[PDB]
Amino acid sequence: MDLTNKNVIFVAALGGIGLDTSRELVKRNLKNFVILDRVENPTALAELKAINPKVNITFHTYDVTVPVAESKKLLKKIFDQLKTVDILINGAGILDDHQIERTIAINFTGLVNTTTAILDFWDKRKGGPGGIIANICSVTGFNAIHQVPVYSASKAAVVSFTNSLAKLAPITGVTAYSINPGITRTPLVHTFNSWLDVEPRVAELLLSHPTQTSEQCGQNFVKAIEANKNGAIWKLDLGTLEAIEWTKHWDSHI
Amino acid sequence: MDLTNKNVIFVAALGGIGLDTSRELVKRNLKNFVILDRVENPTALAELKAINPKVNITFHTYDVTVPVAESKKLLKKIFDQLKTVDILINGAGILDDHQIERTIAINFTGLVNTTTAILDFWDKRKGGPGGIIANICSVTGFNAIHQVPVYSASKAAVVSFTNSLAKLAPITGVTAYSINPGITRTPLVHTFNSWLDVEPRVAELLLSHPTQTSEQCGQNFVKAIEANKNGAIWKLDLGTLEAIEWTKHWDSHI
Numbered sequence A, B: 001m002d003l004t005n006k007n008v009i010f011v012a013a014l015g016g017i018g019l020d021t022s023r024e025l026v027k028r029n030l031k032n033f034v035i036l037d038r039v040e041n042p043t044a045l046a047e048l049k050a051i052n053p054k055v056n057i058t059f060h061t062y063d064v065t066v067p068v069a070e071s072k073k074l075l076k077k078i079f080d081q082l083k084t085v086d087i088l089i090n091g092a093g094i095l096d097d098h099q100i101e102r103t104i105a106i107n108f109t110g111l112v113n114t115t116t117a118i119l120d121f122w123d124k125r126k127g128g129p130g131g132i133i134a135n136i137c138s139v140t141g142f143n144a145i146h147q148v149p150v151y152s153a154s155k156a157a158v159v160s161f162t163n164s165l166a167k168l169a170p171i172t173g174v175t176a177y178s179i180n181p182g183i184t185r186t187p188l189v190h191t192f193n194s195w196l197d198v199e200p201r202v203a204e205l206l207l208s209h210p211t212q213t214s215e216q217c218g219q220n221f222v223k224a225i226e227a228n229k230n231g232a233i234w235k236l237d238l239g240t241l242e243a244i245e246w247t248k249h250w251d252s253h254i
């Protein structure tokens, strides 16, 4: 995929991983880069524009926990402006296992709903042009951090959902792949709520081990987008990009 | 695990798989069998009691989409009656990918919330005695039916969540394992809503291939409970019981 002159919507572009990905995206000379996020960040937007003034950068406030009809309304506004969208990147996430409902609503339901909404515009069965979805999941969707079991289970859900989208591309015209960071250091310093406080020190304990920077992650993220491989399960860990082979434990035969 | 004289709570005991499991459970001569389900079924309750009159069978109306505080209140009522509970079986599920929010609420959030609520009574850190949780997930949590991607993703979530619970048993005193049916024929005749109607004939197409009966499933379900293996990922497919080895793609190192 050559990102030059493409139109990209990125939900949650302005977070720790998001902003370093966005810096690399705008270097790739997009036509339009449309950032949807829960809170404004006007300085980040200006930083991005300064990297490549040719890119048209727009922002819309967006909370992925709104109903699907509300997402459709916002997407309509964007499609009526841009006419075409080439790639949707769904990057929203929280980690807080004291917030069970909200974890699931943001990390899983909200990603499914944004996806369902954009299919109104893209599905080839309704006369749409098809499209490409990149979902930020997590290595915890392969193997949990069991001390944050709700977070990890929410990410297993979207790893699954993304695999399924990719298998539906012959029907819908929409391809998809997952982007699964390992532990990635950003400008922020975190502490996490574990489920029922089984482990108050998850952030500290993770950082005892080798990790990667958000710059490394962001570089490999854009490399994965450029590879444009339907059904890939990309691991972005320890500064490398690696496609994972999903184990076949069971087959529906359909 | 010898189920004689044990106290078992079974959420969703009266469905297609549930009722055939329940028939085998009561043959195992439980002390108390407490059935929580969304709708009453007085004839089923009487059938069960007739299999083994020695078992004390009680019923409570329960919808897994209520808030965790409401689940705690009901569990308190049960613990104050029984004093001890040996095993919780979480079996609620729907399949309807036109109902995205409700699929996730029942299949994933609700199972997590019932689990979180019973940990108030069992967690060894609060002076509780520990316990055992059996979660009905699905083979689709290993490999999706991609035509029902929301259902399948909800089941990947609870396969993950259950693996994580099992790894927390040293902290909480609560062990856990997943029960993952393959395609299982019950007394009901179904048709399914696929996501965005990608495939209107999922039920018919599944049944083209080898399947198993709910009696076979129920027999292997009780066999898995009797094995009492923390962290097992049980596949109940084609009439057999098989533990699955989960692939290690990534390690947190914590």
Ligand SMILES: NC(=O)c1c[n+]([C@@H]2O[C@H](COP(=O)([O-])OP(=O)(O)OC[C@H]3O[C@@H](n4cnc5c(N)ncnc54)[C@H](O)[C@@H]3O)[C@@H](O)[C@H]2O)ccc1[C@@H]1CCCCC1=O
Pocket (backbone or CB within 6 Å): A011, A012, A013, A014, A015, A016, A017, A018, A036, A037, A038, A039, A062, A063, A064, A065, A091, A092, A093, A094, A095, A106, A136, A137, A138, A139, A140, A145, A180, A181, A182, A183, A184, A185, A186, A188
């Ligand atoms: N930084 C990491 O190491 C990491 C990050 N993730 C995921 O990568 C994505 C970006 O994470 P981050 O940059 O590290 O975090 P950060 O908190 O900096 O960014 C969160 C982004 O999501 C946005 N957001 C949150 N809630 C909403 C909402 N309701 N509506 C719309 N937008 C919302 C928010 O505004 C921001 O753009 C999230 O999905 C993370 O869960 C995946 C893997 C790892 C995680 C790290 C934690 C332990 C386990 C891991 O595997």
Ligand SMILES: NC(=O)c1c[n+]([C@@H]2O[C@H](COP(=O)([O-])OP(=O)(O)OC[C@H]3O[C@@H](n4cnc5c(N)ncnc54)[C@H](O)[C@@H]3O)[C@@H](O)[C@H]2O)ccc1[C@@H]1CCCCC1=O
Pocket (backbone or CB within 6 Å): B011, B012, B013, B014, B015, B016, B017, B018, B036, B037, B038, B039, B062, B063, B064, B065, B091, B092, B093, B094, B095, B106, B136, B137, B138, B139, B140, B145, B180, B181, B182, B183, B184, B185, B186, B188
């Ligand atoms: N029968 C199967 O072949 C099968 C069944 N499951 C799961 O096994 C469990 C039992 O399914 P079943 O007996 O086939 O279905 P059935 O519809 O007969 O039973 C559903 C049970 O969940 C209960 N329930 C539903 N909503 C609620 C709620 N809000 N609150 C409390 N209880 C509720 C309901 O009252 C009933 O006891 C569910 O979790 C299923 O998702 C797992 C695997 C397979 C599925 C079959 C469909 C395609 C993909 C497969 O892998």
Ligand SMILES: [Ca+2]
Pocket (backbone or CB within 6 Å): A002, A003, A004, A028, A029
């Ligand atoms: Ca270029």
Ligand SMILES: [Ca+2]
Pocket (backbone or CB within 6 Å): B002, B003, B004, B028, B029
């Ligand atoms: Ca016995």
